[PDB]
Design a protein around this ligand. Structure first.
Ligand SMILES: *C[C@@](*)(O)[C@H](CCCNC(N)=[NH2+])NC(=O)[C@@H]1CCCN1C(=O)[C@H](N)Cc1ccccc1
Ligand SMILES: [Mg+2]
Ligand SMILES: [Mg+2]
Lengths: 30, 258
RNA sequence: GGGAACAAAGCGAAGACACCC
């Protein structure tokens, strides 16, 4: 998507990850 | 949101709260998609069966909020609306087919750490991500249970709630209800034999169902909380408006009104 | 083959699979 949409200031922009997003990432494998 | 957890600060910066001017009350969820456009469910603004029909002047959008009730000065932003746009083929008479609406703000909001737009998916991203078994995330300040006793505990959350849920196979969604499931909807939730629970509920409508792309790291809004039968019942699933299926209309409205 | 099809009526771990050129 255009510009920096969907990249969170307090997470993706700071290379940090929230407490449950891994669960979403894991579902693409599982 | 039922069986979810407290959201982290800045965790869903595109989260928007639709709020009534009088009486002052929370109406629905919604999402920020640009500095001046907000996406929500059409039934949040128009639903004759409940004598609901709001115009631009009746409400406010509160962006960047965490607490459901506390005014968060210098964090949240309160914006007024220039105009509302209900999908032209929105079917409130039957099953909420095309439960989608756009709201243009009077003036652009400045983004911040707590305020940032989510992306809408392109055709390929939609094809790749919206697949049975993959999980998305739903957020809202809606009811914590479908029914409850206030004398034994408050029905609404103190802060924004979040829950991750898997996308369900279409025939399974169809077989779970007698309501007709149109091609402009999808459902999500755990099956009784999966163990886990979770669902959106009344009050969560208009909130976004998002997915994080493993290929570019961006969050995309795949659905809009729309309807269900009860909340978190076994064998039942939450239904969402299929954002990509109706993206042509979204684009039209926006290219047509800046 | 392309456009259009405000994903309209329809048709599975769902994938544009009557109008115009
Ligand atoms: C308006 C939204 O807050 C709310 C969201 C419900 C989400 N529920 C679950 N389990 N995820 N939507 C509604 O309350 C809609 C508006 C019309 C009535 N309705 C329902 O969900 C009914 N329970 C079912 C229904 C009735 C008429 C047409 C479609 C669905
Ligand atoms: Mg269920
Ligand atoms: Mg259709």
């Amino acid at each position: 998507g255009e510009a920096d949409c969907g990249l969170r200031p307090l997470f993706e922009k700071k290379s940090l990850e929230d407490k449950t997003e891994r669960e979403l990432l894991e579902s693409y494998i599982d | 949101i039922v069986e979810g957890s407290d959201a982290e600060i800045g965790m869903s910066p595109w989260q928007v709260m639709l709020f009534r001017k009088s009486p002052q009350e929370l109406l629905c969820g919604a999402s920020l998609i640009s500095d001046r456009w907000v996406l929500t469910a059409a039934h949040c603004l128009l639903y004759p069966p409940w004598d609901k029909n709001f115009t631009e002047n009746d409400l406010l959008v509160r962006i960047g909020k965490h607490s459901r009730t506390r005014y968060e000065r210098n964090i949240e932003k309160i914006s007024m609306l220039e105009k509302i746009y209900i999908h032209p083929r929105y079917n409130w008479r039957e099953n909420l087919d095309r439960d989608i609406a756009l709201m243009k703000l009077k003036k652009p909001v400045a983004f911040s750490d707590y305020i940032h737009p989510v992306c809408l998916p392109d055709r390929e991203t939609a094809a790749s991500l919206l697949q049975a078994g993959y999980k998305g995330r739903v957020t809202g300040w809606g009811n914590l249970k479908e029914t409850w006793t206030a004398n034994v505990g408050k029905g609404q959350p103190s802060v924004l709630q979040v829950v991750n849920l898997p996308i369900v196979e279409r025939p399974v969604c169809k077989d779970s209800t007698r309501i007709r499931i149109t091609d402009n909807m999808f459902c999500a939730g755990y099956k009784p034999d999966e163990g886990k629970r979770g669902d959106a509920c009344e009050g969560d409508s208009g909130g976004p169902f998002v997915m994080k792309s493993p290929f570019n790291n961006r969050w995309y809004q795949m659905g809009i909380v729309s309807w269900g039968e009860g909340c978190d019942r076994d064998g039942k699933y939450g239904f969402y408006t299929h954002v990509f299926r109706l993206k042509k209309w979204i684009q039209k409205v926006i290219d047509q009104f800046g």
